[PDB]
Design an enzyme around this catalytic site. Structure first.
Site, short mmCIF file in Angstrom:
data_model
loop_
_atom_site.label_atom_id
_atom_site.label_comp_id
_atom_site.label_asym_id
_atom_site.label_seq_id
_atom_site.Cartn_x
_atom_site.Cartn_y
_atom_site.Cartn_z
N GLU A 14 0.81 -1.22 0.00
CA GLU A 14 0.00 0.00 0.00
C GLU A 14 0.84 1.26 0.00
OE1 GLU A 14 -2.98 0.04 -0.58
OE2 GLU A 14 -3.67 -2.02 -0.10
N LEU A 253 -2.39 12.75 -13.44
CA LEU A 253 -2.32 11.64 -14.37
C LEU A 253 -1.51 10.53 -13.73
CD1 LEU A 253 -1.75 13.59 -17.74
CD2 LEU A 253 -3.67 12.04 -17.14
#
Ligand code: NAG
Ligand code: NAG
Ligand code: NAG
Ligand code: NAG
Ligand code: CL
Ligand code: MG
EC number: 2.4.1.221
Lengths: 389, 389
Positions: A14, A253
């Protein structure tokens, strides 16, 4: 005066921005605990087991102070740095470690229930015993740390589901929940949640760098952006949509998983710019600030397509200093002051930006926005979660 | 001779003895590949991502030479050490990395089929790209290693199911299968397996240590235990049950997961000890050699219960020389020569001893035996797997 210590860690794959979320998950719990007993949350040191994830710079044993403002968090829940835990308790000693895991029996749907039970370990344990019968483990990179005991909890609901159990065996001065991502939020869009989320305020240094960048290349200041800023986050309550934001387009992005993740929810560069130009035209925006993980080859391709792209490129020493999360925060802080923002589908990075924008008071129509995959059929926008004070 | 290279790694939690099993699974894939192209398998260095699991004091980048006899291995399949691969290809550069994973959709019962397909990655990929566009990863702890491309492969069956796909895209000089444990064996009881398995013969110095221990404390030698030994392992065939074994009982007690894994298939210490004494009575054995992971408090108690227990406790410097798998291999070796042996339920360590016993020729009735849980009702014994020469 003898209080109890809560510690946690997250499943190693994570990222930074998921960890920020789990943090609020754990804080929900601790608040529930504080209704009964004296507890304090110990902030897990930053930096990741996989050292190759952050190339050429070692990100290790990083105190929260390098990212967030401790007094700011403290106004919400009692909080201390791990290095300070190590000093108050005699060494780096943790009494009980609980590895969170699902229930092995699963469920047939309609059965699902918030519950917690001590169970055998499903995956074999990543902790192991030394010649002293102490448990050795990852422990955020502090090698000298030892757990006295480790075992597994199968768990289901919101984080506070665990509080009755922790409040029963009082034997443990310090309890650590590994794999805290297993815990859900108590109630996510909620007042309790927002108290916490608001209280994570970026460290003054990252804000200053980000602000000065805003004024030099974005023609953006807090005054001109109609974002009255307040120091104490408790005292800052802003009417929705009052905030204007700098005359620029923020965009995030995310290319990292585009290819190997076979993603239909992210645009091609050529598609991304089409949308961007459409946004620039719509909102009269001369400059776009881009936060991206794109590699050099793909960035150049973007740079050629979209010359007006402005971007924050940390100098080598800046990166060595602010580290990874630090740069990420600046990028987020800047996107969050944009007139209009467009993010990446289900990106945790974009998610933090949203919350940050909602806090500043920017109109949601400018906040919850995402690039559609080029051929993506029906593309749903991220959900607006308003603040509750 | 321009030959392709195969490399693999296994899911980090996995211990030493499951790794040795996977090796044979891979090696069977290599055998299937050699039916077509010139290949060589590259031996993944020993030493573990989660370093705290091993008592090995950060001892890493360990060649197979410290455990296994390389010529011995090479008579089964072509094999080279990893550092040797760095030399023979240009640098530490792996052309293509495939991360093995399960099919995302699972299956409906009766639909299960051996298949391999390039698929979107399920878990977030641990590899990550640098500013030269190369992928960096764990790579057996060699920081320098660069992969040129990375994707995930969903896979189901025996390890050789990957061979046709590996032979279609020939652009890849070197190929790495991460999460190799996802591959099954081709046929486990069979000749092909046993060729690989029989071929893994411990490094001379390791057996030399065990024979020393045997000769000395166990009153045990090959000529006394009627276990004639043969260097060329292809030239070693023994009639089943021709082997007697030393005047001792070998036992393997794995206690690691006893508690945190809520185990009912392993005995309490007393249940173990009583069973041991009954076996020593039945089989007329003077001494008992115990190989165990028991930490001090337990070993202390095990020692009171079973004072006649002789054990292998290496010196600080011995643990350094032989490292971790070395101490394990010695223990296994010693167990493998007992007149009678009893292991632990579903223990890979025990399995590895099972296999070694069948190779020495000892009667199955004296090999496949496990302690029972104190209250365990069914209590199945481990399955006899005969060598097929
Ligand atoms: C760890 O937990 C077990 C089970 O509650 C307990 O019996 C044991 O005493 C603990 N270990 C230590 C070192 O205190
Ligand atoms: C920058 O924005 C301000 C708003 O306060 C505006 O008045 C000014 O014209 C802008 N200057 C440039 C360089 O475009
Ligand atoms: C590497 O593999 C991916 C599949 O995930 C493929 O789409 C990509 O084009 C490949 N890259 C190169 C350099 O061949
Ligand atoms: C050792 O092994 C031999 C068998 O070769 C046996 O006859 C002898 O009694 C054992 N004991 C000792 C102390 O030598
Ligand atoms: Cl970081
Ligand atoms: Mg007794």
């Amino acid at each position: 005066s003898r209080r109890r210590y809560l510690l946690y860690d997250v499943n190693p794959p994570e990222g930074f921005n998921l960890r920020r979320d789990v943090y609020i998950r754990i804080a929900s719990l601790l608040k529930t605990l504080l209704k009964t007993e004296e507890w304090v949350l110990v902030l897990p040191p930053w930096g990741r087991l996989y050292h190759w994830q952050s190339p050429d710079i070692h990100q290790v044993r990083i105190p929260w102070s390098e990212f967030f403002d401790l007094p700011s968090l403290n106004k919400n829940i009692p909080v201390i740095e791990y290095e300070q835990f190590i000093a108050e308790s005699g060494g780096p000693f943790i009494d009980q470690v609980y590895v969170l895991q699902s229930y092995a029996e699963g469920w047939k749907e309609g059965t699902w229930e918030e519950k917690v039970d001590e169970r055998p370990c499903i995956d074999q344990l990543l902790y192991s015993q030394d010649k002293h019968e102490y448990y050795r483990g990852w422990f955020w990179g502090y090698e000298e740390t030892r757990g006295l005991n480790v075992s597994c909890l199968s768990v289901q609901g919101s984080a506070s589901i665990v509080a009755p159990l922790l409040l029963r065996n009082t034997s443990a001065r310090s309890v650590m929940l590994d794999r805290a991502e297993n815990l859900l939020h108590d109630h996510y869009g909620g007042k309790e949640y927002w108290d916490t989320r608001r209280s994570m305020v970026f460290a003054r240094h990252l804000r200053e760098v980000g602000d000065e960048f805003r004024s030099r290349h974005l023609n953006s200041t807090d005054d001109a952006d109609r974002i009255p800023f307040q120091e104490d986050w408790m005292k800052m309550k802003v009417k929705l949509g009052s905030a204007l934001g700098g005359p620029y387009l923020g965009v995030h992005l995310r290319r990292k998983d585009f290819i190997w993740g076979h993603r239909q929810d992210v645009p091609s560069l050529e598609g991304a710019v089409r949308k961007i130009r459409s946004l620039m035209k719509t909102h009269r925006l001369d400059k776009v600030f881009v936060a991206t993980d794109a590699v050099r080859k793909e960035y150049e391709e973007l740079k050629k397509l979209l010359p007006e792209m402005v971007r924050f490129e940390p100098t080598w020493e800046e990166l060595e200093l602010y580290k990874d999360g630090g740069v990420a925060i600046i990028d987020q802080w800047i996107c969050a002051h944009a007139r209009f923002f467009i993010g990446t589908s289900v990106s945790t990075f974009s998610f933090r930006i949203h919350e940050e924008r909602e806090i500043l008071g920017l109109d949601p129509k400018t906040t919850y926005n995402r690039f559609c995959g080029d051929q993506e059929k029906a593309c749903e926008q991220p959900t607006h979660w308003k603040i509750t004070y």
